[PDB]
């Protein structure tokens, strides 16, 4: 599948994708673009905002930093929203989300853009920061109750999915961004499938 | 580089992609998209037209066929109008331009999508076929003076390449559209460079 990242927002932000791209600072404007393989699984992209590096690779990023490193390897740090996806596994379909578990920290789209009739897509375009809860404020924008309050309510890790919940902070996430996911166990409401061949669009601020 | 392929003709298009890529049948509205390595060079994408294939994608097209095969592994057959590329060679700087040297059968547009800000792409977006010289009409399309007359001042092959000048034939070309090749030694004004790490798309039918 191809994914091309274009950053809309009116500030640079460090794009970031594992398994496959790590990160690249793009302009307000600029487009990445990124090949990956059928079959990848636990696969994300999402943004880092304001983030300093040397040619060594490594700095920090007050959103999203992961681990130190520009090409990211591995995860990063809440609050951010997260662009999610999985290539071709049950019955070669596509599964792909934005989540919100471990924050927001700018706006997302992740929409196919081509290679099958695939249009249904995710979007969370509305500034979930403007009237985010003051328990959640975070480094200018609005983290969530999982990695705020590191409790299995909220969390629902391994035992705790067994009675994971919605809550109150799950549901300002889940009225500000339908399509996305607002807390672990919200399934029914945030998994988006698309045919195996089809291309996507990640866009932040849409 | 990744080329984004798009048709946007009324009919199909048997798009074709050589050396990376093979064939794709593209119906109106649809897109491919191509990872060409750096350092690819000597490359071309183009349509063919009236093609019929089977299961095994063998068969035949009527304008651009390429050896039989659906997935082209080698350059296709004129009249068909070509998007040529090299991929980061001299000074990181890649080499593209739309030739009409083995004539035309569809429009076609190869701009800069992104990666750089690279914005000047070759366009040749007039039916050429409407104001075709009645001679060099073949297959429904227009071709040009090369493959049809075989001949040294129009080929410019080998020793033949120092007397290249335009002809009256290379001329029609060239007032259709001044950004493509009309004939071998067109250099000075087809010739479109863009740093490496630009994107392209080539639309059929512009």
Same mark, same amino acid.
């Given at each position: ?148 309050? @590191? @409790? ?55």
């Amino acid at each position: 599948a191809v994914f091309t990242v274009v950053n809309q927002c009116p500030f640079t932000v460090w794009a970031a994708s594992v398994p496959v791209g790590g990160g690249r600072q793009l302009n307000r404007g600029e487009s990445w673009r990124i090949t990956a393989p059928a079959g990848t699984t636990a696969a994300r992209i999402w943004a880092r905002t304001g983030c300093k590096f040397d040619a060594s690779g490594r700095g920090s990023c007050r959103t999203g930093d992961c681990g130190g490193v520009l090409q990211c390897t591995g995860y990063g740090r809440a609050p951010n929203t997260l662009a999610e996806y999985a290539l071709k596994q049950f019955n070669n379909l596509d599964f792909f989300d934005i989540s919100l578990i471990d924050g927001f920290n700018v706006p997302m789209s992740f929409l196919p853009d081509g290679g099958s009739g695939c249009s249904r897509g995710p979007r969370c375009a509305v500034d979930v920061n403007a009237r985010c809860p003051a328990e959640l404020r975070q480094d200018g924008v609005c983290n969530n109750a999982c990695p705020v309050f @590191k @409790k299995d309510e909220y969390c629902c890790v391994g035992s705790a999915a067994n009675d994971c919940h919605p809550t109150n902070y799950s549901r300002y996430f889940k009225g500000q961004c339908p399509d996305a996911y607002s807390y672990p166990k919200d399934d029914a409401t945030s998994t988006f499938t698309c045919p195996a061949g089809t291309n996507y669009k990640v866009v932040f601020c849409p």
